[PDB]
Structure formats: C-alpha cells, structure tokens
C-alpha cells in the first residue's frame, strides 16, 4: 500500500480530473453501460474510466481539494499571481514521486516543476519580473540513501551539471519544536528549531517535522479540542510517497514546507531566523540572461 | 535557502499582512475550508493564502515586529514624523532585494526607496520641509562585483544620469571595533573606524560589521550575560539576501546602519567623526525645485 | 554621506537627547522589546527611538559633549552668563545647515540663531543688557556661489530688508599663518592674517583655517607629540554639512571661530588687530529701542 | 566684525583674565576635558571658557599688553601713583564701549571711569591729594549724532545735572599736522594743532588723528623705514568700536590721547599751548568737599 | 581741557624730566617692547612712561624750554646767582596749581616756593645775603573768590599766622597801557599803569594784562610784522589753569610778572613808579634771625 510522507498518495485524484462531476470524463460504465465521459453517477453506477493525464493538464487538474487557495489566488486576495495559476496551475510547487524501499539496493524517484524560460526577450534582459514561459521541466534520479547519485532528465544543462558536480540532492526544513503526548496532544514549544540538512533519500527516515498542533488548551494558536487537524507526518521509511514542498534550482535543494502559516512567527522558530519554505520565488523574481534558468 | 545579510528574509511575514490575527486576510482553510480571510487560526486549521502585496501597502504592512519603533513615531516621542509614516509607512529606509550569487556572472538586485516630489508647490519652492507626496519610486540593476553596471528603473532621470555616470553604486557602513572570542563574546574597542567603502555586490563578501554586542562584563554598554541580541551580521557571499538600510539619493549611495544607537558615541567611533547612517534625511529637509528629486 | 566642515555633523546626538543614559528617552526596544523611553541599555538591547526634536529644547540638549564649557558657565567661572544658558541653552552661537552641492544649480541652507526682544520693557530702553527673550528666529536661503540670493523666513522684518537690499550674506573668518609638513604636522606662524571675506557659499569651498596647531616641538604653545587634537578643517565643496559659528545680525555676517583661545594673542594674528569672532554679543550688550533686535 | 577706532577691540582679552598662563582660568578642555581653569595649552587642547568679568578687576586684568607701562607705574619710574595702580588698576583711563551705527537712528554708547569720593574724611577737606576710594562708576547714553542725547547711569548726581544741562558729550583731541603719501609715509608738520570740539557720535566719522609715524628719514623723530608702528586712526562711521581716552568729569568732555610723548614737544603743537590729552588730574589732585566728586 | 592763564599747563613737560633724549627715562614701550627709560624714540615707537616728579627735582627738571635764560645764569652774564640755581633749580618763582571753577562753590589752589632758612649759622645773623638751604616750602588754600579764606600747608608759623590774620591772599601786578585793534595788533600806549589789587581768587576773572606787543609799525619796542610773540593773556574764569610769578612771603602776595623787559622803562608805567614784579628778593637779600623766613 502507499505511505503517505507529506500528500495524499491518492493517484488517481491527482491525474484524472476530479470523479463526481456530471459529466465526469474520468467515469465510464462497468461492463455495457455508457462509453467513458457519458455516466451520471448520481443517476446510474458507473467506474473510473482508467484516464491518466501528462503535461500541464495536471497542475491545472489538481483541483479536487485546496479550493480555498485556488480561489484565494484566482480573483481574490492572491490576485497578484492570478495569470500565472490560470494558464500553468500551481507552476511553482514541485511534485517529488518515489518508488519502493529497502535502502541495501537504492530507491528511486523522480521530481517535478517548473523553470522560467528567458532565452527570449532581447537578451541582456535583468527585469524583476520573469516571461510568461516556463516548459515545466523535470529531473529524475537513482541512488542510495548514503553517497553517490546518478542523474538524467530534460532540465536545462547549467542545473545538471550542478547536480552532477554537487553529487546529491539535498533537503532541507525548519523543525518547530514540539511535545507530544500519550493522547496524541502536540504541542509546540518557544525555541526549537534544529534545522534539517540531510541527503533526500536520507528524508525518509525521519519524521520529526512539526506541521501545526492537534492538542487542546494550546498557548500558542490552537484551542479547540475537537479537530481534524494534520499532525507530525509520518515516517515511511522503504515505501512508495509522494514527498511534495519547493525545489530551489540555484541550489538544487528540495524544500519541505514543514511549518504552517500560524508557525511561522518570531517566538516560535527563533533559534533560526530564516525559513527554508519561501525560497522557491528567488528563482523567479529576480533573474537574468544566464543564471541557471 | 534564504541567507541573512542585515534582515530577516521572512518574504511572507514583509508583504502579507500578518499571520496570527483574527479574521487573518492572509489565512485560508487548507482544503474545503473557509475562503480566504475568514478562518480563525485559533479555532481552526488554516494555511496561508498565498497573498502578497504591492505599492504603498508593503511599506505599511511591515508592523509585524518593531512595535515599539511604530508606537514611538506615531504618538509617541518621535511624533514629529508621525504624519509622513501614517500615511506613507516607513518612508525613508531603502530595502535592496538581491537575487543569486556566483560572482563569475554577475548577481541581480534591485532597491526601493522613496523620493520627495516637488514638481507642485508655487515653483521656486526653497522651504526647509518637503511637500507630502514622495511616488515610492525603484531602481533596479545588475552587474559582476567588479567594475560595470547595468540600470533600469523608473527613477528621476537625474538620479538615473548619474548612476550611469558614475557606473556602480557604493556601500559604506561604520566599522565599531570589536574583538570576537571563542564562546562568542564580542566586545567593542575603544577607536576603530574602518570606514567602508566598496561596490554594492562587493560588499556581500565581507561581514566586519560591529553591529551592538553579545558579550558579559563589558565595559562599553552590555552587562548580562545571557541575553538574545544580534552581534556581527553574516557573509552570505552567493545567496538570496535582503540588504536594508538607506539610500542617499543625492549621490547614489545605499548606507548601511551598521552601529545601533548605544554605540554612536565619541569614544567608539572616535577616527571617523561622521557616522554614515544618518544621511537619508538631506534628501528631505533641504530640498529646492531642482536638485535630484 | 555627511561631511564635516566646522562640526560633527551627527544629526542624532544633537537632535535627540542622548543615548547613554538609564532612562533613555530616544532609545526603544528593536522587535518588540520595552516601549521607548523604557529600554535599559546596559542591561537589554535596545534601538534609536527616532525621536527628534525642535525648538529652545534643541539648543538645551546639546549638552552630550562640551560638559566642561557647560559646567564653566552654569556655575563655574563663566557665572555671569548662567541666567541665560540655563533657560534658553547656547542662545548666541548660530547653527547653519547646508544641504546638498553641484554649485551649477545652487545649494540650500538655513541659519539658525537668537534675536534680542525689546517691544516690551517701557519703550525708550537703551541699558547697557538685554531683557531676557530672544524668540529663537531662524533664516533660510537659497542661492548659487556667485551672485543673486533668495531669501526667506520669520526673522524681524528689519534684518529680512538689510539682507535682501545687500543680496547675499558674507563669511569671515581670522585664518592664522600655519606651514602644513608631510606627517601632518601644523605649526603656527607669527604674523600672518589673511582676513576672510567671501560669500557664503563660496566659503564651502576653501578649507584655509588654521584652527589649532597638531605637531610637535612647536614654539607657539603645543609640545607634546601624541594627542588628538582638530588641525585645519576640510573642504567639503558639494556636501551637506553643518557650519558653526556666530551670527552677527546687525550686518547679517554669519562668523566662524576660526581661531582657538591659545591663539587669539597679538604674535599670532599681528597684521590684522581684530578678531571677528568676538561680534556676537554687540547685538546683545548695547542694545536699545529699535535696532535691528 | 568689530571695528578698531583707538584701542583693539578684543572683547575676550580685556575681560577674561590672560589665555595663555599655565592654569588659565579662561581655558576650558572642549569636550569631555578638564573642568575650566585645570587644562595645560602647552599640553593639551583646550578652548575660551567663556569668562567674563565684572567691575575692579577687568581693570586690573588688562595687564596681557602694556607690560611695560604696568612695570613702569609698579616699583619703577613712576612709584608714586603705585599705591593707586596696584589696588584699583589703571584708575583714571576712561573706557567707552559704543555700539552699532546708521546714525540715522541714533546708536548707544556707555562710559567707564573712575571718579573720587570724598563725603568721609573730616568735611571740610580741602587737600591737594583724594582719598584712596573711587567707586569706579560709570555712565551710558542713547543719541544720534546731532541733537539731543538721553541719559542714565548711577554716576554722582553733580554730573548728572550738568550732563543733562548740556544735552551732549564732547569729544576734544590735538591734531597735530600730518602728511600722507601713497605709500603710507607719513610725517608731521611744524606748525598745524586744528583742534577738536564736536559731539562724541560725531567723532566717529573723522580720523585725522596724527598719532605717530611711520615714514622713513623723518624729520621730528623716526628714522628707521621698517618698524611697526600705529599711524593715524581709522573712521569706523556705523561699527561697534571701543573708543578709548580720558573723561573729565570736572566739565564732561571725553578727551581722546590723540598724540604720544615724542610729539607733545613746542615745535609740534605750536598754534595751540595746551595738550587736552593731560586733564583727568585735576579730578583728583585739587578736589574740596563738594565740586562734582 | 587745561585753560592757559600766564603759563603752559602741559603737566608732564614741567614734571616728567623731558621726552624726546635718547635715555628718555620718561619714556616706555606700548605693549611690550623695552621697559621705560630704554627705548629709542628716533629708532622705535615708544610712549610716555607715566613718569611723576615731586620734590626739589621738579625745579630742576623744568630745563626743557627756557635754555636761554638757564645759560644765561648758569656760567653766563647772571653767573651770580649760578650757585643757587645748580643747586636749588628755579628757586626764587612760585608755581600756583588751581583746580576748577564755578564761583559759586569756591575753588581750590595751592602755591609753591622757597623760604630762605636762618635758624642756624650762629644766632643774630643780619647780613646781606642767605644761607644756601631754603626748604622748598608749600602754601595751599581754599575758598570763594569773595570773602574768607581757610588755609593749610606746612609754611613756617609766621606766615600762616599772617595769612590767617589778613584772611585772604592778593594779587598785584603793573598793566601796561594798551590799545587792541581787529586784527590782533596789540601796541602800548604812554602814560597808564592801572596797579593791580585784587583777591588771588577773583584775579581768575579779568585778562587785562599787557604783556608785550605783537603789531607792527609799534613806536615802543616792537617792529616785525610776522612775529609769534604772547601779547595780553586769557581770562579762564572757571578752569584749572597754572598761575606763575613770585611770591612775596612778607605780605603774602602773589605778584605776576605782568610786564616783560623791554616795558619796564619810565615812558611806559608812568603814572606807577615802581614795578611790582621785582618784590621777591626782599625775603632773600635783606633777612635777618626773625622775620618771617
Ligand atoms: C485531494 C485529496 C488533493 C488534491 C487533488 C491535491 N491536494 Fe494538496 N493536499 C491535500 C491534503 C489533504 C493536504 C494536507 C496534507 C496532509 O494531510 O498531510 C495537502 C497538502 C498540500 C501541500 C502542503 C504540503 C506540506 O504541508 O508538506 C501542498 C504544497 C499541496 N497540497 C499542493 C498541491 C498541489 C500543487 C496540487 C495539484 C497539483 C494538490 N495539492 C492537489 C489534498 C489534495
Ligand atoms: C518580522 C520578523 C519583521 C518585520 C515584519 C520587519 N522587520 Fe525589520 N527587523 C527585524 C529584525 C529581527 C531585525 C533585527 C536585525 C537582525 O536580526 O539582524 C530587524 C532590523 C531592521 C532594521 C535594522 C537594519 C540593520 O541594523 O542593519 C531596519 C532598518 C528595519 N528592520 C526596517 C524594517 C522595515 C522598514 C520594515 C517594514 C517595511 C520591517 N523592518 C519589518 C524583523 C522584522
Ligand atoms: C557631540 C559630539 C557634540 C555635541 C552634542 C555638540 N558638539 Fe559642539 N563640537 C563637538 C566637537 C567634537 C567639536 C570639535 C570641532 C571639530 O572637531 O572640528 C565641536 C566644536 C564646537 C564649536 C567650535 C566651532 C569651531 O571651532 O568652528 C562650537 C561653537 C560648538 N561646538 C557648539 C556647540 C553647540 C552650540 C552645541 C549644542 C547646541 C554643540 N556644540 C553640541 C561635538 C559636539
Ligand atoms: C592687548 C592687546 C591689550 C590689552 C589687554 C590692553 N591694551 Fe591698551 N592698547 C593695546 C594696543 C595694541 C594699543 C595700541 C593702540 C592702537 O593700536 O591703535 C593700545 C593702546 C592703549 C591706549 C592709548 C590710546 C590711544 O592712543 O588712543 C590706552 C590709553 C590704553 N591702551 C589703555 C589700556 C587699558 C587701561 C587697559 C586695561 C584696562 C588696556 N589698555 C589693555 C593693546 C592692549
Ligand atoms: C615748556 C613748554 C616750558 C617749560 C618746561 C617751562 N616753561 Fe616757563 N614758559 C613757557 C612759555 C611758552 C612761556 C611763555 C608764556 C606764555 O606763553 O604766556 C613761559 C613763561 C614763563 C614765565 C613768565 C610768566 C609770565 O610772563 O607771566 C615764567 C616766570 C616761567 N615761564 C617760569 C618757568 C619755570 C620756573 C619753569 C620750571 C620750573 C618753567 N617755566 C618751565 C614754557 C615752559
Ligand atoms: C498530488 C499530486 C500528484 C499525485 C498524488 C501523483 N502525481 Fe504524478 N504527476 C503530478 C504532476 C503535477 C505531474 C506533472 C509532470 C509534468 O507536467 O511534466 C505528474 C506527472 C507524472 C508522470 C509523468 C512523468 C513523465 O516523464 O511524463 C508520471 C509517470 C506520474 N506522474 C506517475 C504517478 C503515479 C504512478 C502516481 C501514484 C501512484 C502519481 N503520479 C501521483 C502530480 C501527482
Ligand atoms: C514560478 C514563477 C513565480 C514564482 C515562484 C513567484 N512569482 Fe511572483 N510573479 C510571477 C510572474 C510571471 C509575475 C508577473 C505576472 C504578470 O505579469 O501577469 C509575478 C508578479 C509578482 C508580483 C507583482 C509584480 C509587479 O510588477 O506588479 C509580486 C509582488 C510577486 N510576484 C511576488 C512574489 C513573491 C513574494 C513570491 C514568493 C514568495 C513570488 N512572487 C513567486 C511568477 C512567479
Ligand atoms: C522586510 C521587508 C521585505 C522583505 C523581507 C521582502 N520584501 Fe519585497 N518589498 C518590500 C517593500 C517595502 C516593497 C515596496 C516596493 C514598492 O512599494 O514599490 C517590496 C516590493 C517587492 C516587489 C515589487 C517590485 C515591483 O517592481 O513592483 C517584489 C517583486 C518583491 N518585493 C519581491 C520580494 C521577494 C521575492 C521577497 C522574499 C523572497 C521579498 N520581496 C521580501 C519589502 C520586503
Ligand atoms: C522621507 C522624508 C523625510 C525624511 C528622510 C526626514 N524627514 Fe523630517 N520631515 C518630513 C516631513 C514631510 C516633515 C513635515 C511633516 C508635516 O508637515 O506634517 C518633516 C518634519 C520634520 C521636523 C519638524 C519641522 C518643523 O517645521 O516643525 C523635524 C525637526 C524633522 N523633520 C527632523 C528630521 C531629521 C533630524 C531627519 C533625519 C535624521 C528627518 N527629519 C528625516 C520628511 C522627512
Ligand atoms: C550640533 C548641532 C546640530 C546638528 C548636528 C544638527 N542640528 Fe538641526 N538644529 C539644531 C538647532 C540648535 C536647532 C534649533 C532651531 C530652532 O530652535 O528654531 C535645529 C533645528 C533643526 C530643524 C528645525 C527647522 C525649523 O524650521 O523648525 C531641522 C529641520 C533640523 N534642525 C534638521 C537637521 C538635520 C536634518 C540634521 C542632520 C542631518 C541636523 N539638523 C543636525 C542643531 C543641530
Ligand atoms: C544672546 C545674548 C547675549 C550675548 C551674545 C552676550 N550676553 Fe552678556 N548678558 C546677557 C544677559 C541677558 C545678561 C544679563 C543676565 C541677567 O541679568 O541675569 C548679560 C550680562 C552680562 C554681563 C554682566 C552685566 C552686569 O550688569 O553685571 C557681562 C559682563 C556680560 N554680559 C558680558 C558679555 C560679553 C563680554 C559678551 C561677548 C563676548 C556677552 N556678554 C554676550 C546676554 C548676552
Ligand atoms: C581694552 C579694554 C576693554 C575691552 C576691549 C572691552 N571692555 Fe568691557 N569693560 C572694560 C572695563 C575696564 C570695564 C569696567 C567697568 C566697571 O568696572 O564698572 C568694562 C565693563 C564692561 C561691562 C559691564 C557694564 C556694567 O554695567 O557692569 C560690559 C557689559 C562690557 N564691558 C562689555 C564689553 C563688550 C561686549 C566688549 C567687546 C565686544 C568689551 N566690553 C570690550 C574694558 C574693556
Ligand atoms: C611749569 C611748571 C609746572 C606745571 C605745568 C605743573 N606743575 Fe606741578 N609742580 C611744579 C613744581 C615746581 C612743583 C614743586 C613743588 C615742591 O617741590 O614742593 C610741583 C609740585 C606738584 C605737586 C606736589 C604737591 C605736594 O604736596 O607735594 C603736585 C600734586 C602737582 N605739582 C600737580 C600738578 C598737576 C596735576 C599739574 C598739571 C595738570 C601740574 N602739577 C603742572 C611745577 C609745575
């Protein structure tokens, strides 16, 4: 079965375009019913059509849960970035897909995102804005959690060559300290940060990564008793995730977005001043002819 | 990861309207939750909207920390300047985005600022005071730490002339002596200067800045022991930094605030008489018709 | 940056009431510490309140160097004059600020001084003192080096005449015969005068004043070879700096202190008998119903 | 700038008590030195403390010239007035302090003198010696050159009436003739005394005061071409000067030593006997009881 | 200023031991140059050194005009009287200091001479001439110039017993006949001597002595038209002037010595036989043990 490292390992959700629509082009009838695309399911049983997507239908297609945020970007408060969503889908949170276990062999994975395109427009361009051009590139690789790495892929030559030099690809987040206790109550702590630097294949074995509280009578944000919140992750050490967070390509660096947006104030990260999640927009806003874009 | 080179590059906490409040414009329910603006942190799990802010609305968007400097200014003993900073935020310190490192090709870094307009005003205008209106104007560059640069930006065009003239824009700081031991103790000297002055992407090499004291039992200012200050700031020598201080127009050069207040007096600065900080404001106070405004 | 011409031209500590002391009234927690005015810097980190100040409080609160001088007048052997300084600070040396260069466009400048009042007192006083308001009136100008002046401000309507009939203020100044040698060494002459005369503006640009001796073995009155003493002054041609001196306003000729007390004896200034610096209190001291007070 | 009329018009060295000395009660370290009074010039940089005098002993501090004159009176040459000298300084030498001009308005002037009392000692005292008691008082008045005069002061009421009577103050000197050539020679004549009657604003105007050589082959005392010696006067018309003679209290007359020993001789001054510059004795050696003492 | 009535009141001439010799023992440095009695007044500028003569010197040191008739006795045509004049200087004429006026109140005068000594040179002496010691005595006095007298000094007994019998002191002098024209020519007449009597005090009031010619074409004596002789003296009724003449001890009468030499011929006092000009040798050439000497 699939390990759930910090998404829903759910691939269908993620590449079929939603399932309870009335149309609904991902359903088709089970054994002589109506051609795929065609069932109403409210209406009349009908089964996943085993569509899959490729491409850039896919950001756009993840539309199934995060419908705050889609519309909090798309024509409301995060209207800045509204063109960019809309015509790419999230074009800026990378999608790290793994496969099996048993650190003895070496596992592997493959990551996906998206790179500025700036070959174009009159070359000498160093604006603080980039081209809406981004050819959603991505880097795939082999390797044991300890030492050498082999790399392939499409990815623009400057960032391979990085990669090959570098020998490995690294992790890195900010762990808010917590206390845990025997009823499941987390509670974070006031100074604790124990910063993460580890090789990625070596992130799996870990899990002590914050990610807000699910305890009651909390002095920091949380005070209700009774929520479904999403506590500490999980470890999944030799399975199959679905790592999701940012990838710096300067560094090529795999940035876990490990606290929440309440956990990200100066008593509560204060040992380490700086936060490792908002550094993807760095490779965006402030390019130039070369760089590694 | 994002490197600190004088401020806290938190790009979420400077351009988001805070994070803890109430109705949190910036708050977002993580899956099917409530919109944007409408969850209560303390109440219920949400994340980050993904909101960013641009214009006027980022300068005064930034009271998240430096409460007491906010309440000294606006009704406080700093109430002279109170009409310009509750209209404009805080108007006259520069902040000087930067992007990338690998000094081989050349950085990115762009710096805004404000600039006094003086176009209206009965012309022949020669008053002591500006006129309330200053355009939040930017100049943004690239170029190598050694010799040319390249500007754009919608910036007065005298001011534009001679940065072109000129072919780089300059750093200088006050270099408060200080001696650095093993367990972290600085303490200041009694007469050292070191007066800086260096190219803007040159002077992301070198962290010589005094910047207050960590120390116990010394004989300057400090005296306890165990106190969180911030002693000699960081290289962050080919990195995503936010450099902040003030940008005197007049000759095109962005000034660090490299002493605190304690430690701007005779008998710690004594070789240099002037101290570099304070120099944005004849920008402000003795302006005329022309000149670089 | 700020440069130097007759004073350190440190725009906090003469504007600001200290730094150094418990209280602390321009110090201000940094983050979000102790309000202003409440800091304990010896024991706690703590920031510049931005705390700026205007009117008599101004000319008082110079009293951060200069203990001796003011210790001598209040209470000491310059006892006469206690009444004065004691409720109104320095009320007869006159502050001007200069701001900005490039001597094609013309500079801006304000001076700052006191003015006798005598519309009260039984009209037809004509004693050998002032009573005792002086209304702290300031000047301020523009104008280029050569020629023409505009001018502007609050100061009695009788001096306003005088300097727009005269059309530009003067500068003079007693500059002692000095011989400048490679290590820095100054030494006095003994007879040589070389009066000043020259426009204001154009004053910024020659740095001929003797202003102390520096050397060693010098026959005039220094012989110690290591002290830290202020030689001849600098040039500072397109700056902002701050010229001190005294204003006399009954022929609206702002005078510098050119010469120290150790040389204001008559083998040392013989070619020209007087010395300018002392024409202050002439506006003060014989004094009656109309004037130019 | 002050303007020289008879005497050097150095406000400080007449009033402060010498600069030069080793304790140098005038002198004062000028930022956080030793207190006023305690600095060594000859060792360290100290500046004016801002002395002033009042009453007998700025009379006795004008001994920072005339070494001579003070050595010659004090157990020299001229041991009989010693007594006088060594307890009430230079007792009979009338000290006029003017100021400002535009004798459209009128400017203000005071006196300083000295004048015997005699209501002690046995009335009827009729002795050709005054008692050793002067109370060293003075008279100030306000006038335009021509006209009338107002006055004030604590002077004894017999001089009062009289000065009121009159309505002026004249000023009387001997001018002994004198030529001028282009390169500054000047000689005196034989036989030219032109003597002077005019109200004291209106001597202001007019320098024809011989007061000694300075030429080269003359025929009446100076023979040496290169000396520095002090030729006729200076008119100062609208300054603040420091007029300095006798005062005759006897008739009001402010007498000005217009000539010096060398030239008081017959073939100098023939026209005119009499020398008004020697008159202040007969206040002293021939008083009674009453008269104007 | 001094008032001449038979003599010049220049105080220092007669008291000062002359200016213009080399030594000049009355003559010192301005500021600081040689002490007094050193400096060269035909080689450097040097003032009066404020030299005052009292005693038997004053006779002698009065060799500054007058070298004519001094040579004259001195080993000249009067080589009789050359050894009390080398000893005694002018021993036989009375000076007569007066000070002030305003007849209302009363003057002040003293009156100096010499009184032959007899008390030794063995008892009963009556010869023709006195004994070489003549104590250079001093009579001064008060009083309005109608009425009484009050007297004191230290003359000998009999003459103040006389003077305070009399109650008053008179002045006797012969007047010469003479007629004044409008341009000044003064000629004498024939037949007219209108002999003076009068109180010492009131003789201040009228000017009518002859004392010589200075027209031309004059029948008596004089015949040059371009002349400076002294014709009839001043009034100066209410000043400090200088009365010179003789002293007659016997009487107490202050006689002037109204005519000069060439008119004391018979054509020219008729009408009076005798001169009362040569009355002072009685107390001299005719004395005896008693009397009033
Ligand atoms: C349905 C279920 C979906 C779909 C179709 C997508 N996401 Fe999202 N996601 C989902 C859940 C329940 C959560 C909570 C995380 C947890 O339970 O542990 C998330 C979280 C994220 C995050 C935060 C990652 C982290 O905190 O470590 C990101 C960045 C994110 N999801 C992105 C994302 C994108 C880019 C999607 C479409 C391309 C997408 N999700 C779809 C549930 C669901
Ligand atoms: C939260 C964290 C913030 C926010 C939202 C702002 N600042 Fe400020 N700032 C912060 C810290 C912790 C510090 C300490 C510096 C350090 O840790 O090294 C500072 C410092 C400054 C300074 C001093 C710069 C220097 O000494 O070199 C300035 C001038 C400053 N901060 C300005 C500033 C402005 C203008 C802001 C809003 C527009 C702002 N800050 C926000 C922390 C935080
Ligand atoms: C701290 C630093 C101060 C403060 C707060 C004031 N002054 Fe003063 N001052 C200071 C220095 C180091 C010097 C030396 C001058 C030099 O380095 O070149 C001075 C000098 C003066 C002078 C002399 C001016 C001259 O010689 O040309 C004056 C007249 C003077 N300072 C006045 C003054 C007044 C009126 C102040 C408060 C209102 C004042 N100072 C404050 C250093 C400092
Ligand atoms: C220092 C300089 C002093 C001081 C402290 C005093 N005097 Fe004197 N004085 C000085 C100079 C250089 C001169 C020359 C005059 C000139 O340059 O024109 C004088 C002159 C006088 C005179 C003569 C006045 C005349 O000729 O018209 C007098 C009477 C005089 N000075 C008096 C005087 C007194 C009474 C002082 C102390 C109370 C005194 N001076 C101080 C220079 C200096
Ligand atoms: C310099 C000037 C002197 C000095 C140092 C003395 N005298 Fe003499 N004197 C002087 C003048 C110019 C005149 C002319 C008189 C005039 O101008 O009206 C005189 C006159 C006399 C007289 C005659 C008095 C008379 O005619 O009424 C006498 C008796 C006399 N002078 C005496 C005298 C004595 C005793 C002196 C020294 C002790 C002396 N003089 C000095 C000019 C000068
Ligand atoms: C929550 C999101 C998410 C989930 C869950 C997910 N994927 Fe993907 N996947 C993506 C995105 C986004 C891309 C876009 C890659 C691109 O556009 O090039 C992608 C692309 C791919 C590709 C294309 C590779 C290529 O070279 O074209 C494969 C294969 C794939 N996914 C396999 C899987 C499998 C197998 C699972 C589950 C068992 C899975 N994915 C689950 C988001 C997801
Ligand atoms: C993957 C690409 C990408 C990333 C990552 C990204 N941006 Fe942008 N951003 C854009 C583009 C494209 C635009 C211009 C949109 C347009 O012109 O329509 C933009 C525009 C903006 C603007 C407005 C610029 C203007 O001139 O008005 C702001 C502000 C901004 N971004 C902030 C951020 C911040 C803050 C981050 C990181 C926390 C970030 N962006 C991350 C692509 C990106
Ligand atoms: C502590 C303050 C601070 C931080 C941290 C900060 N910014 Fe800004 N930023 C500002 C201010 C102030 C402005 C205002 C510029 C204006 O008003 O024109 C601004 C403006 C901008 C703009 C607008 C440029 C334009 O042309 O309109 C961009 C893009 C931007 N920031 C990007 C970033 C990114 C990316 C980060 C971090 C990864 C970041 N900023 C972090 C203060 C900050
Ligand atoms: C970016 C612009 C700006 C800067 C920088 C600035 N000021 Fe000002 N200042 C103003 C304005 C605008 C006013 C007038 C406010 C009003 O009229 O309401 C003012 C007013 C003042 C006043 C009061 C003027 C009066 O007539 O009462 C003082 C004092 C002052 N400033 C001091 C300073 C000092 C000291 C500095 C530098 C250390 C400084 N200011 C920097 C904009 C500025
Ligand atoms: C050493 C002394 C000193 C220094 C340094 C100094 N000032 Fe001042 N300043 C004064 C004094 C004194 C006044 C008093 C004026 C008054 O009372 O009217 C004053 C007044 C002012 C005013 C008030 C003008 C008005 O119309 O009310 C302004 C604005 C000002 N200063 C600006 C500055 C600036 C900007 C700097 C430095 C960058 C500076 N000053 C540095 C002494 C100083
Ligand atoms: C700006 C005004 C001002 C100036 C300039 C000034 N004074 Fe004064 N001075 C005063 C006042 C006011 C008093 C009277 C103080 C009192 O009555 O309490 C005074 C009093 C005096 C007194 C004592 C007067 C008395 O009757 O006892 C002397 C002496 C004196 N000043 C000397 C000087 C000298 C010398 C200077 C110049 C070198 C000078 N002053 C400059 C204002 C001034
Ligand atoms: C060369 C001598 C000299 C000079 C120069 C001089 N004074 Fe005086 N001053 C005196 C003397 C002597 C007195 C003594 C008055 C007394 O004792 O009553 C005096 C007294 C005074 C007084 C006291 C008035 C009173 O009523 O008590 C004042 C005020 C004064 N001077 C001002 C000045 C000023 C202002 C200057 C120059 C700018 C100056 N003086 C220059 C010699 C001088
Ligand atoms: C032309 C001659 C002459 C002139 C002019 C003159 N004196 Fe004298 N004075 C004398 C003589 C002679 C004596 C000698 C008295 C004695 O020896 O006792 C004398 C003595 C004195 C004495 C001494 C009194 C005593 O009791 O010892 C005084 C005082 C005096 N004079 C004052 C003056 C004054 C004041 C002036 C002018 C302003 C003046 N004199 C001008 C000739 C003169």
Same mark, same amino acid.
């Given at each position: 079965?699939?390990?759930?490292?910090? %998404?829903? /390992?759910?691939?269908?959700?993620?590449?079929?375009?939603?399932?309870?629509?009335?149309?609904?082009?991902? @359903?088709?009838? @089970?054994?002589?019913?109506?051609?795929?695309?065609?069932?109403?399911?409210?209406?009349?049983?009908? $089964?996943?059509? %085993?569509?899959?997507?490729?491409?850039? #239908? +896919?950001?756009?297609?993840?539309?199934n849960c995060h419908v705050a945020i889609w519309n909090s970007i798309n024509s409301g408060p995060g209207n800045v970035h509204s063109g960019l969503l809309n015509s790419y889908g999230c074009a800026c949170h990378? $999608?790290?897909?793994?496969?099996?276990?048993?650190?003895?062999?070496?596992?592997?994975?493959?990551?996906?995102?998206?790179? &500025? =395109? @700036?070959? /174009?427009?009159?070359?000498?361009?160093?604006?603080?804005? &980039?081209?809406? #051009?981004? =050819?959603n590139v991505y880097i795939c690789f082999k390797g044991t959690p300890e030492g050498t790495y082999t790399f392939s892929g499409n990815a623009p030559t400057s960032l391979m060559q990085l990669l090959e030099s570098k020998?490995?690809? /690294? $992790?890195k987040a900010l762990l808010v300290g917590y206390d845990k206790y025997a009823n499941g109550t987390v509670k974070a702590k006031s100074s604790a940060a124990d910063?993460?630097?580890? #090789?990625?294949?070596?992130? @799996?074995?870990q899990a002590g990564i914050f990610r807000y509280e699910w305890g009651t009578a909390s002095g920091a944000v949380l005070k209700n008793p009774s929520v479904r919140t999403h506590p500490l992750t999980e470890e999944?050490?030799?399975?199959?995730?679905?790592?999701?967070?940012?990838?710096?390509?300067?560094?090529? #660096?795999?940035?876990?977005?490990?606290?929440?947006? &309440?956990?990200s104030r100066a008593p509560y990260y204060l040992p $380490?001043? +700086?936060?490792?999640?908002?550094?993807?927009?760095?490779?965006? %806003?402030?390019?130039y002819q070369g760089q590694l874009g």
């Open positions: 079965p699939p390990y759930s490292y910090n %998404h829903p /390992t759910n691939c269908i959700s993620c590449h079929s375009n939603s399932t309870g629509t009335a149309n609904s082009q991902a @359903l088709s009838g @089970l054994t002589s019913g109506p051609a795929a695309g065609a069932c109403d399911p409210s209406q009349q049983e009908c $089964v996943w059509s %085993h569509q899959v997507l490729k491409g850039t #239908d +896919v950001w756009k297609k993840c539309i990378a $999608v790290a897909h793994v496969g099996y276990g048993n650190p003895t062999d070496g596992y592997t994975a493959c990551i996906y995102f998206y790179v &500025p =395109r @700036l070959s /174009t427009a009159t070359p000498g361009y160093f604006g603080a804005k &980039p081209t809406l #051009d981004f =050819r020998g490995e690809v /690294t $992790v910063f993460l630097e580890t #090789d990625f294949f070596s992130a @799996l074995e999944a050490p030799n399975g199959e995730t679905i790592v999701m967070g940012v990838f710096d390509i300067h560094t090529g #660096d795999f940035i876990l977005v490990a606290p929440y947006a &309440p956990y $380490v001043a +700086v936060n490792p999640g908002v550094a993807a927009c760095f490779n965006c %806003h402030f390019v």
